[PDB]
Structure formats: structure tokens, C-alpha cells
Design a protein around this ligand. Sequence first.
Ligand SMILES: *c1ccc([N+](=O)[O-])cc1C(=O)Nc1ccncc1
Lengths: 261, 13
Amino acid sequence: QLNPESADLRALAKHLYDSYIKSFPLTKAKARAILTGKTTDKSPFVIYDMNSLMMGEDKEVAIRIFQGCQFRSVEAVQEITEYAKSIPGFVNLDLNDQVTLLKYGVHEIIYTMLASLMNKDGVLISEGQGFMTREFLKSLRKPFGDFMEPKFEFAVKFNALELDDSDLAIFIAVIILSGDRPGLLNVKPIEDIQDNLLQALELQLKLNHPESSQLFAKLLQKMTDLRQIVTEHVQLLQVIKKTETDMSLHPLLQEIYKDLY
Amino acid sequence: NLGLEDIIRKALM
Ligand SMILES: *c1ccc([N+](=O)[O-])cc1C(=O)Nc1ccncc1
């Protein structure tokens, strides 16, 4: 069981973890410390209704929200791309397949990292300075009230797997090396890498999660839920076009949504 | 998104 081949998989897990720490300053451990109220450095303010929203103040509306959250996500996309450079074999793939892998993968990784910011009560905002409640978000007028609730539904179940940053480093690498993306030119060298990452993930979860039989399968099922969240955005855009009701939104709420995804 | 592909292509440089 401990042999040259398993040692190589442990080495790959550590290489990915080290690169993950270098690439992503916003770790899961950091997010959870704030959520469970462990960090006494300027604790986050809770925004749970319109009155607290106003006390928290420190070209359709929805389209502007999406333009703004995509702009605020540029740094995350850059961090993800830097991380992908550290995955052995990735930079040797055809450049167009590297771009294709990242253009679909970044959205799923952003949602994975957004889950770290979420619990059943709400989500961290304003660089950890604020906490926006789930039920306040859900209470807002259509179509805005429906934006975030399926991501909370995903995050609560995802967080119950109790993955740590060591796990997440390999899981995110597996997401990037998805051989089933549309428009990929050479699928086999991608699959070759992903199969090695999958072996490394399998071993990592056995060593790190004695409590969870079928955790490997359950985590692979989550990749299915991530893709569905992304494709639900197309439907959300259609709901916005169709919407024949007032879609005005408080500017502070617009600002909060631009911090989400 | 062509803009997103642009950001990725430059970060890959
Ligand atoms: C940005 C800000 C908020 C929301 N939202 O509440 O649903 C969405 C976005 C956004 O642009 N999300 C996105 C996901 C996947 N692909 C493209 C965009």
C-alpha cells in the first residue's frame, strides 16, 4: 500500500496544496473562522433586512449586476489560471484547449469557493466585513429573490462533506481537467492528466476522511451540481428578459449582488 | 464570453 506509486500520488497532492495556498489567499479555513465567529479582528456586520441594510452602508439592473460580478471576478480567474499552470502537464496541452478548460472551469471553481463563504444562514460579503442573510436575499422581488437560493442549497450540502483546503486543491484540479468540455481538440492528454488527479484524489479522501464511505463518488456527484448551477444562469437571463414587472433594486443591494456569483 | 477568454489568454502568458 505504501509504495513508489502511492508516494508519487501523495507528492502530487502536496504539490497541488502548496500551489493552491500560493494562488488563493481566500482559503476555506479563513472563511470558516469568520463564519463561526472565531475572528475578533473587526467581526462582520449582519444585514438581515432593509433597516439593517441601511445601517450597513459602510443597462438593466440585473445585467449591470452580472457585469459587475464578472469584473470583480477577474482576480479570481487570474488566480485559477495561475493555479492551472501548476498542474503537471497542463501547460503542455494545446493552448486552445487550455483556454477552453479554464473558460468553463472558472465558473464552477468560483461557486466551489463561494460555498466556503456560505452557511445555512447567509453569505460573507465586502471582503468579510458583511454577512448577508439567505432569507433576506430570498425575500427580494422577482427575479432577484431567486438568484442565490439554489447556490445556498448546493453550499449547505457541499459543506456537509467537511472538505478542507488539502481536499479542495485536488478537487479543483480535477474540475479543470474535464475532458468533456465542448470544443476540446485533443481529449486524451487531458483525460490522462485527470485520471492521475483522480487517483490522487481517491487516495487523499481515504487518508483524510475515515468517516465517509463513498465520499469520492459523492464529491464527483457535486461536479454535476456545479455544472447545473452554471447552466441555470442561462435560464435566469431568459427570466430577466421576459420579466414584465418592476425590477428596480436598492443600490446597496445591487452592490451586494456584485460581490456574489 | 470573448472577454472572459481574453482575460484567460493573457493570464496564461
Ligand atoms: C454575478 C453576481 C450575482 C449573480 N447572481 O446572483 O446569480 C450572478 C453573477 C454572474 O454573473 N454569474 C455567472 C455564473 C456563471 N456564468 C456566468 C455568470
